[PDB]
Nucleic acid binder design. Sequence first.
RNA 1: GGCACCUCGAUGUCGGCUCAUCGCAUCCUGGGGCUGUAGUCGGUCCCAAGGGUUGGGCUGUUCGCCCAUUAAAGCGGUACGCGAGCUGGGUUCAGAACGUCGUGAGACAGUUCGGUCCCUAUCCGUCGCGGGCGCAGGAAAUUUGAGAGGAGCUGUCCUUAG
RNA 2: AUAAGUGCUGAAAGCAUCUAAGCAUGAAGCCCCCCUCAAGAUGAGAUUUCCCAUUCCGCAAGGAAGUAAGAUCCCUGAAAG
Lengths: 175, 143, 37, 207
Amino acid sequence: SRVGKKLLEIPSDVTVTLNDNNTVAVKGPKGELTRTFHPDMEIKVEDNVLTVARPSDQKEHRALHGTTRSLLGNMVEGVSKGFERGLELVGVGYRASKSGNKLVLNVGYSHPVEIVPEEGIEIEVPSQTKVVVKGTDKERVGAIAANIRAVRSPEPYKGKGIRYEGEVVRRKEGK
Amino acid sequence: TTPMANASTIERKWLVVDAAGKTLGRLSSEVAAILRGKHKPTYTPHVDTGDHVIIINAEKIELTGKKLTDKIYYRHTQHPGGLKSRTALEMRTNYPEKMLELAIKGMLPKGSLGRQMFKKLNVYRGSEHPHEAQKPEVYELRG
Amino acid sequence: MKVRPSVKPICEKCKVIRRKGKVMVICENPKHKQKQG
Amino acid sequence: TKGILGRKIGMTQVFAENGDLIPVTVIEAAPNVVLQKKTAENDGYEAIQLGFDDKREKLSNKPEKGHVAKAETAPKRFVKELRGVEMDAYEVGQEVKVEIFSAGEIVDVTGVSKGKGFQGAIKRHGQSRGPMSHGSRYHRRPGSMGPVDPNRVFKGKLLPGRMGGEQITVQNLEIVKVDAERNLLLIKGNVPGAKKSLITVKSAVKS
RNA sequence: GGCACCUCGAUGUCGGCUCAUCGCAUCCUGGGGCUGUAGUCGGUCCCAAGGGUUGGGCUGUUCGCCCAUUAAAGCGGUACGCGAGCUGGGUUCAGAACGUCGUGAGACAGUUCGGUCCCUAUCCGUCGCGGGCGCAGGAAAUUUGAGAGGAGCUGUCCUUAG
RNA sequence: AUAAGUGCUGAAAGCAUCUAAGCAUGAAGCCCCCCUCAAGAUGAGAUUUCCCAUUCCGCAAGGAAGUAAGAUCCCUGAAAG
Ligand SMILES: [K+]
Ligand SMILES: [K+]
Ligand SMILES: [K+]
Ligand SMILES: [K+]
Ligand SMILES: [K+]
């Protein structure tokens, strides 16, 4: 596990605390993330460098080692820099609008689709055709972005729908 | 010459078995043995020589493999197409006492005496049982 | 989807994987999507 | 959940304000009383037990006298539980009167359906006759008992027997009119069972 | 079809009627992938057996063709389910006839007209209804719900919107 | 809660990857929700209320006899059969 073995530099503004049962809490400027890992993994913190160690070269351990390392890296990046996912509404009359904390999507249904974000996730609407999901947890940012994309996933005939920013939607010719 | 236990001679202890972290089958085989009274030298085939068993923490019983999802408890209602099913997961969550009872019931003898032996099993979801009056001893599984 | 006993790379960009113990191809070409069944 | 007990007087009919003709049933419901309040502590579920219909002190017994004593009312010919009711809005002794309901209020309505006695699988099971002609010796028998293979009849082969006298609940009937000087409801439609038979009216389960 | 293993001191045979029940290799309805899927329609494959799945004309028919419907008019198993439940048109007794073969008596998966369908249910099973005892005193009511059964279908129009 | 399906994050395998750990979504179907039966559920459940500890033998065990609360016979009947 090249990924697992790679060393994780902790920025000065991020504190990683290792609690019992391999529960790591990561605190930084953008908030706190807590996560339990598999017992077998050995997460060390020395001189603002987090290292992960696998007990053996068994299939499971090699896989866990890389995963654990990746997740801790995402937690540290998440509390420091945050994660953002960007969505582009493509379509005639396709518009997003923030109503309080709710995202309201008008995407050519006979009713508007409301999405309420979970705790720790902010949705911004910088333009009527652009939505940005921001948060600390990369998984949750991804989940919400996927949920929003699901309301009207991009179609191939004219690319219409909700897409990720820089998504290459495969296109087919109509008539 | 061979001695025989009977109602006058038999004396039944009460045993508490903690099911927490125990394998469904492996617990159940032992309990079934105690209920039958196979652990006593006075064991007599035609009489119920066994001890009472309380099981506690039935909800915390374990299964290996994918048996939580895959092991199915069928049953038939004796009406046509009356075959119902529950998964082991569904059993363990909602009917943990039934799950153990089923496993043990299948490991006892089947006739009149075997049904009688099953009456001395008492299974409970959580940590507590109401049989303080019977003054039950802990019994560790030999394994 | 193709659900078929034989699952194989059609093009070069086909990529055999295994999910849930089932041999699948995946490929930017959505024609080429395979599962084994 | 609101509920009350009543007797089915019998049907009649009622022009609406629009002038449409409404068939009703007349459920006389001289005030119900609360007799017990079951709780989650005591009984392991929350209910109230209503009494209805003043029974004569001849027709009573000491166990019926004794039980109503807390409420402080005469022995009640009909006693039926209501579950799901708001426990703190009753007290043992409290009277329940038809004015608990309103006109336009939806209700479910229980009774015991009018009994038929023993009946054929035609009437009972809405089965088809055979032919009446054409050399047929099969008029109103209940059909083949089923396949050969099993060597037994399949439980749920439907057969002549005693019909009617079931608990039945009709749902989503309207209250047309409430009269509290008579203790009546008027219910658009026809509810299970005879005249004088015990009718339970509740707020509808599917509202 | 092959074989000839049960039944020749008898295991009634086609079609229909009555009553269904099961499988899913799904006819409709539900959910999907791919499309040589613009839309409306479709094609194909995947999940799905919960429910549903028509009335006639002709023929003993099954089948099939046809008429008119339908969301659909599924395919199979259950002694080609169901004759101690029904029918008895066909097949398959005795009469008679045609064609044909035969010297003939007669014969024909050729045809034609006519031609007796028994049984008071013992047991299990099914559907209802009582009596008994049980349930560590004897009673009168009200109950919880382990468990079981039922229900489960779907059209068209309007609007969204030409 | 799931099927097919769609994924999120994610390594094994520096990439990619719906899966290995982890987290979602998703069928007229499954389990409930709705209707009915149901404690012979011998595992015979619960709650409320009523009666109240009698008289005899028999060493006791137990049996017998009057009764309580309550119910029935018999009788008038139907909304039941
Ligand atoms: K024969
Ligand atoms: K046969
Ligand atoms: K016959
Ligand atoms: K027979
Ligand atoms: K028999």
